[model samples]
Each structure stands twice: as C-alpha cells, then as structure tokens.
Target: MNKNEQNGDETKMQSLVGYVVLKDNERAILITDTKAPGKEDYNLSEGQLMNKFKNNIVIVGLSEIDNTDDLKRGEKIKVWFHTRKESNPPSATIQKYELLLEHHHHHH
Candidate 1:
C-alpha cells in the first residue's frame, strides 16, 4: 500500500462507534469515530490500544473492509471490523482477537 493509503486524513477516516460490527474476514479495517478526539490508532496507558475516543482508546480490530465509502463527521456509516489480531504487541504473540459482539452485548 502507498504511504497515503496507510495514513489517511481525518475526513477520510472510518467512523467506528463505541461498538464494533465485525465481518467474516480475518482483517477488518479500523473504522475510527470522528466525533471523538485523538487519532484512530493510538497507544494507551498500561499497554492498551485505543481508537479515536478521548476517554477510551480501545479500537476494535477487523477481518475485512465492510464499506469503502468515505465517512463524514456525524453520519452513521455502516462500517465493519475484522475482529481479529492486527499483528501483536511487542510483549505478546500474535494472538487471535475475535471477540463475540452478540455474547458481549447480550450480557453487558
């Protein structure tokens, strides 16, 4: 991928909400939330990875690209996540990160 493609701008970033809707693929793109502050993929305190939210930076990993349409600031774009490991951190193995949305949401 090109340098620009890897690091796209804010207006073009994916709009991921507090929840993550995953796809069947094992590689979903990070659909960041535009409403929140900060960046899409940011390293957090205590070895936690976060999304675009100020308070919470935990971004959901994806297995596929659900939509290719450019996202707006407040529009609710139907973005999809891969819900798997986007490689691993320096201290751990590249483990699978597919968390069940239904199970977690149902209980929570």
Candidate 2:
C-alpha cells in the first residue's frame, strides 16, 4: 500500500478496478478517478489517505470508465509512482504487505 503518488504513478486500487494515474504537472499528489464499468467514486486506494495535506495534493475527478471485477481484502494489488520515466519511484514490489484501515473522528 505505497500511497505516495507522483507523476505517472500507476496505482491499482482495491475498491476500483482501473488505475489512478498521477499526472505530470501536479506538484502534490493527484489520484485520478478511473470510472470503470460498475464503479463510481472508488475514493483513494485502501491506504492512500494523507495524515497531512500539502497545498499540492488533491483528488481530481476526471473521466470515468468501466467497472472492475471483484477482489477480497488483503489481496495484493499493483502500484507504481514516479515524476519522470527515469526517476526512481518508491519500490512497492514486496509480496507480504497487508492492508491497513484507519478511521478518523472529526468533531464539529
């Protein structure tokens, strides 16, 4: 669940079937919404939420596509990110990673 998406980051989320591609011009992180066949707003990838938001981070909803099939929890998903083609993005190729879910309470 390496959630730091830069430019050209290919993220295969759990809730969504398609990939949330990070664009090249964003200074922060922009996980694009790939509207698959049967899915609407699949939010962020399972563990991609930010504890802090820099001015450069945002979830920009763009075009929509088809829906993904289905998957169980703790299933290994593919994810990648890098500003440029040659730049070394963080490595997310490990095998035994687990999905971590956290809930935040906002008192209004």
- Candidate 2 segments exceeding 4 Å error: 1-87, 104-108
lDDT of 1 at 59: 34
Give the local distance difference test score of model 2.
0.26
lDDT of 1 by residue, 1-108 (tens): 232342455544332343332212332223233342234322233223332232432333332333322222222223323332333221111122222242342211
Task: Name the best candidate (by TM-score).
Answer: 1
Give the Cα error of residue 51 in candidate 2, in Å.
19
Q: Which ten residues in a row have the lowest lDDT in candidate 1?
A: 89-98
* lDDT (CA) per prediction: 0.29, 0.26
Q: lDDT tens string, model 2, 1-108?
A: 365433463554323222222322222123223322123223544224322221222332221211122212222222222222222221121212122222321111
